[PDB]
C-alpha cells in the first residue's frame, strides 16, 4: 500500500508541515506553512491538531505551548488579507 | 552553647541572607539570596520575616518598603523556572 520509496512527494510542503506539526515544533511548522500552496486549510488543520494534542500532552510546558499555537490566528489574518483584496474570490476560497 | 568563635560557618550564605534580612536591607539580602544553596526556602523565609517585621516597623517608609519586599515573587519566579525545566524534580524540590 505504501508508495514508491524513491518517488518524490506530490505535496512536499503539506507533508513537511504535517510532520513538523505532529511534534510540537512550531517555528518550523510556521516556515513550512509560509511555503505551502493552500495556507488557510493548512492553518486550520494545524490548529485542530494542536488542540487535539493539548489534551494528550504530558509536560505542562508543552501543553501551555500547544494551547498558544495561534495557528487559527494565521488563518484569520490571511483570510482578512484575502477578503480585503477581492471579497469575491474570498468566498470561492472558502467554499 | 555558642560555637567556636574562630570556626567558619557551615552555611555562610544562609547566615548572611538572614542577617541582611533582619535589618530591612533588601538589595544586599537579594544578592545573598542569589548565592545561597537553597533559594526557594530562603525566599519564603525572607518574605515571612519581612511581613512579620512590617507590623513592628515604626517609620512609615520602612513599613512601606517591607510590605513590598517581593521575596515571595522571587520564589514564585524561580519555581516557575524549575517547573518549566523538569516538572518532575520540581515536586521533589517542593516536598
Amino acid at each position: 500500500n505504501l508508495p514508491d520509496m524513491d518517488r518524490r512527494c506530490e505535496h512536499p510542503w503539506r507533508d513537511l508541515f504535517l510532520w513538523a506539526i505532529l511534534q510540537n515544533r512550531q517555528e518550523m511548522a510556521n516556515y513550512f506553512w509560509a511555503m505551502g500552496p493552500e495556507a488557510v486549510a493548512a492553518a486550520l488543520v494545524g490548529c485542530k491538531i494542536m488542540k487535539e494534542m493539548a489534551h494528550l500532552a504530558t509536560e505542562a510546558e508543552s501543553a501551555r505551548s500547544m494551547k498558544n499555537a495561534k495557528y487559527e490566528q494565521f488563518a484569520m489574518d490571511l483570510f482578512s488579507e484575502c477578503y480585503s483584496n477581492s471579497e469575491d474570490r474570498a468566498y470561492s476560497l472558502l467554499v
Side-chain angles (χ1 to χ4, degrees), chain A residues 56-58 60 62-70:
Chain A
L56 280 74
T58 80
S62 85
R64 182 180 63 83
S65 78
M66 276 186 224
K67 294 164 186 343
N68 305 333
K70 67 179 71 66

Side-chain angles (χ1 to χ4, degrees), chain A residues 5 7-9 11-26 28-51 53-58 60 62-82:
Chain A
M5 295 299 291
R7 170 168 81 158
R8 40 170 78 178
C9 289
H11 308 283
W13 296 110
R14 199 264 322 276
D15 302 321
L16 277 188
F17 169 79
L18 227 38
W19 164 76
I21 271 289
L22 286 167
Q23 40 203 37
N24 194 20
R25 284 173 178 186
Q26 268 157 56
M28 206 148 74
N30 284 10
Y31 170 70
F32 290 154
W33 174 88
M35 302 267 150
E38 286 165 324
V40 192
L44 294 172
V45 163
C47 82
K48 167 57 177 172
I49 294 178
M50 294 299 291
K51 69 174 45 173
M53 294 182 286
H55 309 149
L56 280 74
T58 80
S62 85
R64 182 180 63 83
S65 78
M66 276 186 224
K67 294 164 186 343
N68 305 333
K70 67 179 71 66
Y71 273 106
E72 177 187 21
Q73 184 64 42
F74 290 169
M76 293 182 286
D77 289 348
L78 192 152
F79 185 77
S80 311
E81 168 86 21
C82 290

